[PDB]
Amino acid sequence: MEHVAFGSEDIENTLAKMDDGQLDGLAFGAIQLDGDGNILQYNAAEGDITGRDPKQVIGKNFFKDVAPCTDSPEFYGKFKEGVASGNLNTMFEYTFDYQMTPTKVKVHMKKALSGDSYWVFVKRV
């Protein structure tokens, strides 16, 4: 297993070195989005939590296609405020309930070290 703790202060530096295969060794869900919300990376732990097949969601828009329950001021609204500002670091609890059993999770959104990319980390609560 890859040893990185959910919510670590330097998580973006640690994950910058990770290929899709190493991202799959994380103890929590990790999704990398571009500024428009398109999925660039989606790890195995995230698929375990949500039921989505990782390879199938890459390239889809997270807010429009995959996760409509997140299209709200409380999730997507925070993401879009962060992209526009060029800075994002927020953690909050949320319930995923689209085409799945309602599941309570802790979400951490953070701007990646890379230019136009943002991370969404997820763990069960």
Write out the residues near ligand HC4 by the rule CB under 6 A.
31, 46, 50, 52, 66-70, 96-98
- What is d(CA 120, CA 75) in angstroms, rounded to the nearest whole number? 11
For the bound state, the minimum distance from the C-beta of residue 116 to ligand HC4, rounded and expressed in Å, comes to 20
Q: What does R_g of the chain's alpha carbons equal in angstroms?
A: 13
Secondary structure of residue 38 in the 3-state scheme: strand
- Residue showing the smallest CB distance to ligand HC4 in the complex: 69
Would you say 2 or 48 has its CB closer to ligand HC4? 48
For the bound state, the minimum distance from the C-beta of residue 3 to ligand HC4, rounded and expressed in Å, comes to 23
* 88 close to 110: Cβ distance less than 8 angstroms: yes
CA 89 vs CA 10, 78, 101: distances in Å: 11, 10, 28
- What is d(CA 13, CA 93) in angstroms, rounded to the nearest whole number? 24
Would you say 25 or 68 has its CB closer to ligand HC4? 68
Would you say 32 or 86 has its CB closer to ligand HC4? 32
Would you say 52 or 108 has its CB closer to ligand HC4? 52
> Which stretches of the chain are assigned E, i.e. beta strand?
29-34, 39-42, 89-96, 103-111, 117-124
For the bound state, the minimum distance from the C-beta of residue 111 to ligand HC4, rounded and expressed in Å, comes to 19
For the bound state, the minimum distance from the C-beta of residue 123 to ligand HC4, rounded and expressed in Å, comes to 12
